[PDB]
Symmetry: D2
Subunit: 123 residues, 4 copies
């Protein structure tokens, strides 16, 4: 995994974020197991609860671009600093990357199982 | 607008739907005012209420791909027939295409304002 | 026909005061008459992750079921000033599930059936 | 709790689970939470034809917390269709954090635990 490449891509996509309500743009980029990179940015709505996270966008692109499994994900905030996925995104990411999906963190990447232990699941 | 081409693109992307819980795959394709076509398919979750609609995916792609406005959207279901967006998606689409956004229907498109009148805003 | 809209609005305004809406600054309340004669209420509950926000009308549906089920007959949604609000598209779909097309939604110009607000619904 | 009455919360969660609106999954869920004013609030899941518009039992708990007069959540039990303890989904972990904080105790068959253990390094303010 080229983490510097992922962060660069997440910063690039964050410039397109639609976040006029919070003023808090977010970019995300992930490496897929087929070797391609997908990206996403947050898209807010006037009804706050219909807002889509950057990580949600990533998962949508994973599938629209032909499917696969996520291997690694970086999310970056307004200043370029690495951000932690919200709990909804942690659950959504788990479905498409599993516990071993690597998630970037301001203090170093780590597996999703560490960030969503004992997850709700199909079992 | 080439509606036939939007419908075919919608069917094509629906093939990648992640809908193992409902078994109801959905695809959507939209023309953007910059001339791009963007696509999306539904992605369900084990926690049902975390599922994402195809139309949400379209709006994500709109912005990750540089922004713009939606001009036309076609949504298709399992039999390839045209579907109306759910209420959430009607609200989400309004933000990015306005009331004039054209929504595919079997006998011709109609504006989104007809599908979501007096819209919260 | 027997719906007391003034009373339902008053319940919505009352519950609005308990809203958790620190990010928008805009509290919303909703109240609904159920076919068992009770009034259920709900207020918006926003979240730091904006897209995890719950609308007042969603809260009404939760209360409907936690309190024993039923069907919604009429619903009023308001801001703090008591001004009537239109449910957002998500809430129109959620409300359809529990009230159907004939559920009455409060509106300045007279209540409107949900089917007028969400035609040809998914 | 260590002295929280988990059996009382579990019983209330099972009670409320009977009223779940889950015809799509056939997976009814109930949840009950102690508030810091000593009352219990409950909720059950409410699914939708558009699957992504489904509301979790724990969401319903948080709604009732506020509509019922506010407060902070102290302890929460979620139970599944068999009456056994269930882990909240990640969305619910995030929502619950807003209304109980990191020290909110979540029921777990191995011993209840703070929400921070289940959502470490949470996205927040
Ligand atoms: Zn998120
Ligand atoms: Zn939808
Ligand atoms: Zn709403
Ligand atoms: Zn949940």
């Amino acid at each position: 995994v080229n983490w510097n490449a992922l962060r660069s891509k997440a910063i690039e996509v964050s410039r397109h974020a639609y976040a006029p309500y919070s003023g808090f743009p977010v970019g995300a980029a992930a490496l897929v197991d087929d070797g391609r990179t997908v990206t996403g940015c947050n898209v807010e709505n006037v009804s706050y609860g219909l807002g889509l996270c950057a990580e949600c966008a990533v998962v949508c692109a994973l599938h629209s671009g032909g499917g696969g499994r996520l291997v690694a994900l970086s999310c970056v905030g307004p200043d370029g600093g690495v951000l932690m996925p919200c709990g909804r995104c942690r659950q959504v990411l788990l479905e498409h990357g599993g516990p071993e999906l690597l998630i970037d963190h301001a203090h170093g990447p780590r597996p999703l199982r560490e960030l969503l232990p004992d997850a709700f699941g199909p079992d």
